[PDB]
Symmetry: C3
Amino acid sequence: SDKPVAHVVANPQAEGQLQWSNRRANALLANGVELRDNQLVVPIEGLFLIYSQVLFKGQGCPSTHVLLTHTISRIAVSYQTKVNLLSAIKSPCQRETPEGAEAKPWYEPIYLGGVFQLEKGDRLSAEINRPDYLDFAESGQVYFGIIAL
Amino acid sequence: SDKPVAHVVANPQAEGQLQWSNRRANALLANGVELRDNQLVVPIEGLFLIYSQVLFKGQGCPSTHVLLTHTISRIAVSYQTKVNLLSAIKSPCQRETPEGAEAKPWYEPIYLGGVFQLEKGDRLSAEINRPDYLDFAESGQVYFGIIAL
Amino acid sequence: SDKPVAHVVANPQAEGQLQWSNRRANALLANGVELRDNQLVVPIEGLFLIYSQVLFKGQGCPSTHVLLTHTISRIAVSYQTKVNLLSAIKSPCQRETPEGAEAKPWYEPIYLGGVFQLEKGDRLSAEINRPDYLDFAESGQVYFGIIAL
């Protein structure tokens, strides 16, 4: 069809980073949607359904409570200011307390999605503050995409 | 674009309450959808994608156990009765009773979304049970939207 | 509309099992999509927005830590290999208390969604690993749907 669409996943070969990639199974990047500088570029003006999921993994809560963030930013015009379209935070560890067991693995998914008005050339970014907790070793766990509506 | 659409956000001014607003950047309310009674009113029959996200924050868990709820209801005809379309529940504080420290800000987001057949005149509500844990201070943290498909 | 669409819900009568159903208010199974073997069957090739949400609830965790998974898989041709399109993992328990604390109940919602180019006869499955932990007590808590775009 002619509808600009994109659904990229995190390249499981990009150890320690969130590399969006469409060279994988069940991924899309068609009709003007481009992947430029790890961001998606909007080919036309209009409404788009934007979304994303990232899966976090760690184990045990080794001091320093981690705040997990996930945002889809918009950089209008042709590299203007970065503004968050969708944003969600999570804390995987509350405790960490002395004496006892340890290393109980934890998993924390985050999903963001919304309908927005985008101008030609705008750039979308799906970002995270903790690429070191990123769990992309298996499929469907981390993804980002948009569809013109 | 001729399709009934909306994407409202939590008014950051709202004195400790959740007040949907379409008067903030990257917000929508077009082609017939009206903001009426903090609810969204459908201008015509048809399929509709309705989504919503709320973020919750807090420091420490003053003993007790909080339950966080979020739910988009449907109130059809000419004022019928609320019926759950989408609903979620979360549990922030799993433990807290002995003393040996304090402070540890937690974050809990909840996302709801689905495709629904509605009639002209139906209104949609997205309510939480605890506006006192609501984190509508910045970004695209709290939003309610819909779109004709 | 004339767009293939479905939005099925967890049948409350199927206690302790995940049985999808369009046999309830605000559910949909129209324009070619079908419920076969508890799976939604794709009636035509196209870009589909796929989503699903499950709510897990449990009474404490007397020892051992549970893992909660929720995936949407695609089976092409007709009973061909399985590939996860959407997948999220979660762990409702990180502790375990030998006396003192008493089996506090937990809630864990998981939402999954994306757009995929599917083909006619393709079957999609929305799975979970712990049906004994599924919460379809109230409406809107467990659903599965698709829509052609």
